[PDB]
Amino acid sequence: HHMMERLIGSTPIVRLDSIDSRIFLKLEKNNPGGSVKDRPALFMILDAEKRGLLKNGIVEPTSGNMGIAIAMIGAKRGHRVILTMPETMSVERRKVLKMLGAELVLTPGELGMKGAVEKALEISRETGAHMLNQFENPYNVYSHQFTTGPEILKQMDYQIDAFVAGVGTGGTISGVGRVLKGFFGNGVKIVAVEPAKSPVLSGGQPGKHAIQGIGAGFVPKILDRSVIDEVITVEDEEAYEMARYLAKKEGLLVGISSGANVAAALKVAQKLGPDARVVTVAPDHAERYLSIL
Amino acid sequence: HMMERLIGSTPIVRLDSIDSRIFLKLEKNNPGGSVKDRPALFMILDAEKRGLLKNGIVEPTSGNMGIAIAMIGAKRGHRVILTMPETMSVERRKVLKMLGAELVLTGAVEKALEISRETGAHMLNQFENPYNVYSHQFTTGPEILKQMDYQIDAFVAGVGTGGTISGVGRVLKGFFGNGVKIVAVEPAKSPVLSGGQPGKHAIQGIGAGFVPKILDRSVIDEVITVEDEEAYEMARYLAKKEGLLVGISSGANVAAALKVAQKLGPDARVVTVAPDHAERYLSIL
Amino acid sequence: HHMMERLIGSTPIVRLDSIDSRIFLKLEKNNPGGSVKDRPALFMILDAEKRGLLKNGIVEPTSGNMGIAIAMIGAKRGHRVILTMPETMSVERRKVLKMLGAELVALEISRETGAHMLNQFENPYNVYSHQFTTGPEILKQMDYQIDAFVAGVGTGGTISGVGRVLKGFFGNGVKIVAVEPAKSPVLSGGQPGKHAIQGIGAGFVPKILDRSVIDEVITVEDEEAYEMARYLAKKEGLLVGISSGANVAAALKVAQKLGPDARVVTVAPDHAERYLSIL
Amino acid sequence: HMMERLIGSTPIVRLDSIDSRIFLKLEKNNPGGSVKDRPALFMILDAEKRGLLKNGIVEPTSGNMGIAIAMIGAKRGHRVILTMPETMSVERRKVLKMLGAEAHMLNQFENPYNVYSHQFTTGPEILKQMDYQIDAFVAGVGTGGTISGVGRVLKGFFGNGVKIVAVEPAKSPVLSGGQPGKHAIQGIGAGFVPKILDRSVIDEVITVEDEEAYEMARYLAKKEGLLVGISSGANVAAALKVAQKLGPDARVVTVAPDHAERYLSI
Q: Which GO terms describe its biological process (chain D) (predicted)?
């Protein structure tokens, strides 16, 4: 009965009237897996199913959310799921993966996502499991081009001055950016967000940072830079502070990357008009981070 | 109108990997992560209208009602004090602090009543307040009726406050009359509605150990009990078989719904509620 | 696949900020039969099915939109539909009914054929349709903030079902205002009369009208209803029928007595293209 | 933002009383009573952002695009001037005057914002509403906006896994490489190939006869209770032929561009 198909997406947008009424926040925690990544996960799996690539299941590297989404969709749809994830990601992710019956292989913190990718490739070779490859798979961008972006455009009454989003895989900003630039052209500003400690998109060196779910340490092959107008950095403590602030002031239980996005969106909105409309995303929820937030 | 717009309009999913006769309404989609967002909103909106909240809100709670109240209070500018038994999952305590509620851990009603006298803070009283029932009469029930294409054989729900079963039950009985079976669920270890004595149990969210004043028995046909272990087991099963990250009371409701479905035809349609999400119970599930 | 169940209801509300921003209008033409009547028709038919009343089909006497709704649902669900109708109602109605396969010609028919009369003025399921769909929709769509709900009475199902819900939530903090034609002011204590406000003003007090939830009755002239229907199309781009003009005209009178920030909700029962010959 | 919020997000119904392989998107639910509210909105919003509407709008009409533009112009405060063949239903004529229609041309056959409306609204809707499972999408071509925008999205998602089928009148089979001619399927068959038609996303063209379209529109009303117009009959007639070639379990989506009460005179 198409459970996951029907549940994933169509998430709400709220105006942050207690913080800055120019900021509009899309609440991706409403997805059944608790994050925005249910969308690319579903698209990638559906493509892989159609092409007959999953006889031996799935193995995928993850910072947590894409893995949770894959694990959930695999549990329902009948695919074995193996994930690799750095040991530095919140322990809540590990427990959720176990609950969903996925197999989790932790990789060295110091090797970051690169380490997770390498271990996934090794497991793929040993087991025959299929890597969807969230950093290279066009269906990641398509999920946002065909669901998230269309949603945003209409939910915002076709009036948007800026769209702001952290880059993990770059799927969100690429797919949404394509739609919004398609509609508005240079009437809309698309702003990528990354950690001050790992400013690779800005042309800097990778580094250790605490904003889980962004700042992969390299430039994803799927990132569509043609739709991005600029890159803004956010400090670890600014992201944490804003996530705490969202819960306290708006009653919105969002994760650390949501904090980062809203902190960035505030900087973007302050640089322009009092009637500016700046949209961003809250990728997931606060209870996936109680261990650290 | 942030909380007004966010709360309710939750999806229903058919549990095809467990039993395709069971349909589960996913109340974790609510902004506070549970079903209690609905009564918390209605009760607050009524208390605001009536000018009762100038000293804030104090409520004794199991957890979800407190989270809902704390969230709405955070956004709408009400001081929220909660008294909560220490036995409830610690996730609740961290969540309540993040939402800026003042918590006093502890039945615990004595402390809440004490606090009300000392501060003037207003007790919404989730067990007595008719707006708990109205929230389900005017949101949840109408949603379920339409979402199920006006075809329901049974509605099964755990009773905490009784709001959900009473408000949904009124709508369903109004439309179906005797053609729908309304089943209340309670813990085997505290089978008060069945006529037994109150007891300690682990099905968080249900089984208050008394009959709530708001419970509308006129809409309820039968009472079914569930064991603590059945509830936990079915909660884990929902995550592993359906990919559904639901809490303990969701396991209890679906365990009961299966029992109900098993007594009915092949094509019976049995609806129940998943009150909250699995990540609220990582410490125990 | 429950076609009619899924299509009926969940209609939008729009704020009339080119006419008066205090008025909020629920667009019932979005229903598959083009009117509010799809809701009571659905509820009454589902009840009758449950109770095994439809072996010989349906016969119902109507002004028009209820006939269209019943014809449509009968067509989809496989019930014979016989209708009886006054000639003074838009001809566009006769063509639509035949398109939907209704047999046009009630008590005698029902007696002779065994066809079942739904009895739109007496059937509690008319009210329930609004108590369980329309009312709940309005309450949430309006963010739980309503000063008044204004609606013309045909069968009285809309105002009764919505008013039950809004009174439940708001108590005396909401005003429920019935609208009727000045020319047939029966709810106001006057004598029935011929009038042009198609869809309201049946000339008697319907049995299902729940007068317990109604605070006041307002009248509208035939010319006011027509002028406002034309105004809605020209100023708002809203292609609504005559009873919609009546409802908005009344709602404006209600709003004008309230503050600048009042929120007054009303309904647009059907669409303008059902009245080309007369509007 | 009245028109922004009302336009789009229309339902799909499965035609179980005709053929349960056919899924119909009901565009009469739009406030102007047709699919053309979508391109009219997008083209008008683009023209406003570009400052092109100081002197209002003037445009060519088969019918529905005129109604949509007149409606949106009425609400948003733009003067609207239109032109139409007398062969189209007189219902349209009364509606336009109701909306106050009597300057910038939008150019419905050449304006990319027509295609964008379907690329960003209709296509995404269809993809989700069909649970990402579609074997064919079948649509008549008037401007070609619908098939081009929906086609782009569905080809992106399914590639050669989805068949995109254009529909035109047997009496004017121009997309098939034949000659134009007069026909009665209002809303399609313009008699030339629109500039915006994306031929890179279309797999085939199927023709429908005038009587086929009419019979099927009457069939939809009598069997499904769906009060749809002539071009909706054409679309479903075509989808039926497509589904019949595909077998038991095929999922074939099409569109019902407008409503039956716009054609009572025919």
A: cysteine biosynthetic process from serine
